[PDB]
Amino acid sequence: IFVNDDRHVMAKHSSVYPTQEELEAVQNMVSHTERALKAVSDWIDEQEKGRTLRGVMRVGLVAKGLLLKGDLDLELVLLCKEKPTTALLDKVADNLAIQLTTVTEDKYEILQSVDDAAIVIKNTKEPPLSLTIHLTSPVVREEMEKNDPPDVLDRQKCLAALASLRHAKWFQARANGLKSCVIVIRVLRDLCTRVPTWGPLRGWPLELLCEKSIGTANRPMGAGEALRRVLECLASGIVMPDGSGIYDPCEKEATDAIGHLDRQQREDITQSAQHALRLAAFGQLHKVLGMDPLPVDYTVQIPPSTTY
Amino acid sequence: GSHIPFDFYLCEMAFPRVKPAPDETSFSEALLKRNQDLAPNSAEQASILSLVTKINNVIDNLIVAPGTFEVQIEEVRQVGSYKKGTMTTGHNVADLVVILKILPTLEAVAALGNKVVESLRAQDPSEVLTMLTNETGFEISSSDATVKILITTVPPNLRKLDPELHLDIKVLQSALAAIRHARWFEENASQSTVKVLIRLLKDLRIRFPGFEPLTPWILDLLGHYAVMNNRQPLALNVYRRCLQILAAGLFLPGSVGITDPCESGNFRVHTVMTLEQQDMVCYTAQTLVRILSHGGFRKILGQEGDASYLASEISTWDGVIVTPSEKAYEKP
Ligand SMILES: O=c1ccn([C@@H]2O[C@H](COP(=O)(O)OP(=O)(O)OP(=O)(O)O)[C@@H](O)[C@H]2O)c(=O)[nH]1
Ligand SMILES: [Mg+2]
């Protein structure tokens, strides 16, 4: 059922799904940078021997396979045995410049920000890719939950890096295998961009909303039916001031994924979704997708890591 | 279509609440107060019960002792609002379905009606009644209550109808379906809260012409479904689900909606509403869902005058501007 609605959501999908040239550039930069951090680590373990860096992880768009046409922002997480500091940031950012040279001749600008507790990497392509390397440590969660240098990195910034890392693991386990979920999220990510009313849902809240709504169905759905179920969900008044709200699965304390929305946003987003639903029900879903009426493993965008 | 719209109460385990469910005490009080305003007084149910007894008896008799009378009655059933106990004040009318043995002609419908009222008048010459026929049977009413008699026949006679000699096949089939509804209702929807809600939905549909296309039968199935289809019944105020399922397109194209329990094989009750009407019902409930969230339940329940404007006009709820949902259906 919903053949025509499947045609439109899949064609819109194609329209927003990044190109091989974008993807190939992502693969390259990510691969280069991962393999470079692999060395930056190996180099340290040697200095100590004569641990500190526990791993490198993909998060955000890259990991979730949520890259679309025009996305120039990638992200990684750097795990540190201890609590990352300013000394380690400078040491990594610097040595990273030397280790990249062992993997590629491409030139990357390396810029650090002690405040963002991260190391940004920009390449030289038009437009340029920007990959942010967030440094953090579990020893930080333990501590928030309950005798070190004087240059600890911003706990808030380090705690957020763990959150996204938990979002990335959750997404791969729950959302990925959910049929039409990753597709609906992409096509709805593009709608949150086009319609400023949906803006506030962009990212985590949208991802959760789509997994929840689509996951509560009895059986697997197509892209058409799946997207509808998300409209219905909203149309029911889920994000209204009073009501469950979207509960955050990656939080030990009860957290609302959309608790930041304000009374009017909740009203507008709901009234929009409501209208979008009926439009879909009456064969006008192309209008919700901002397109003209028409006449495998899409989840896997870039290869999994070898280095990590 | 095998498509089931979204229902929060069908999969609640997947949406844990973050902060304790707000206190809807006032809402529950108003819901009961209104049920009380709509409920028939003690004078009203006496007059009805009295008239329903009198007539039902005369008919019971005519069935055991057909006498010399040329109208064979095979069965009589109490159906509709009076039987289910969802009656509203001001409308003291009961529905009786009388299944005739032979073909239900226009002459017979008048003979039976006049024979019935004549029996009441022989028993009680003092009480004044009036008896009128129509195209669906006849009516008998006193000074404060009316009993509608819905004529039909034993199915055997349905395939043998005559477009010009007997009553409309549709009318006869409607009366029979009425019997199945009451049977199903007494059997399945006979719950204290279900009956209270159906009375409130009947009121909502009257103050909001958006809900006009909704029939008594759909309302019955909707109230029962909102209360019972989930272990225990849902609290009366948790009414909110009725609006929420209409809003998520339970009665929209492509949706299973509700299947008729009194028909075969898998009929969608909302299939009797046009596409335009479906759209209308939906977007009406869509506005009322939003309006209830803004704490406008006193208006929704009709305790604050007319609110029919809420569904077509912009309203400001505590600084929040509410824009009513609009037509999305396009007549090709
Ligand atoms: O001609 C017919 C044939 C059949 N029926 C059947 O009888 C029932 C009449 O239903 P009503 O119109 O009386 O609605 P109600 O009793 O639920 O609420 P009130 O307005 O009475 O308070 C309907 O459910 C229909 O199936 C008729 O009403 N008229
Ligand atoms: Mg009635």
From Swiss-Prot, chain A:
Ubiquitous. Expressed at high levels in the thymus, testis, ovary and at lower levelss in the spleen. There is a cross-link at residue 252 (Glycyl lysine isopeptide (Lys-Gly) (interchain with G-Cter in ubiquitin)). The modification Phosphothreonine is found at residue 270. Residues 1-308 form the DZF domain. It is found in: Nucleus, Nucleolus; Cytoplasm; Nucleus. The modification N6-acetyllysine is found at residue 64. This is Interleukin enhancer-binding factor 3. It comes from Mus musculus. The lineage of its organism: Eukaryota, Metazoa, Chordata, Craniata, Vertebrata. The chain holds residues 6 to 365 of 898 of the full protein.
UniProtKB/Swiss-Prot annotation, chain B:
There is a cross-link at residue 19 (Glycyl lysine isopeptide (Lys-Gly) (interchain with G-Cter in ubiquitin)). There is a cross-link at residue 160 (Glycyl lysine isopeptide (Lys-Gly) (interchain with G-Cter in SUMO2)). Expressed in brain, kidney and ovary; highly expressed in testis, particularly within pachytene cells. PROSITE patterns: DZF. SUPFAM superfamilies: Nucleotidyltransferase (SSF81301). The keyword DNA damage does not apply. Residues 3-332 form the DZF domain. GO terms for molecular function: DNA binding; double-stranded RNA binding. One of its GO terms (cellular component) is cytosol. Pfam families: DZF_C, DZF_N. Chromatin-interacting protein that forms a stable heterodimer with interleukin enhancer-binding factor 3/ILF3 and plays a role in several biological processes including transcription, innate immunity or cell growth. Essential for the efficient reshuttling of ILF3 (isoform 1 and isoform 2) into the nucleus. Together with ILF3, forms an RNA-binding complex that is required for mitotic progression and cytokinesis by regulating the expression of a cluster of mitotic genes. Mechanistically, competes with STAU1/STAU2-mediated mRNA decay. This is Interleukin enhancer-binding factor 2. It comes from Mus musculus (Mouse).
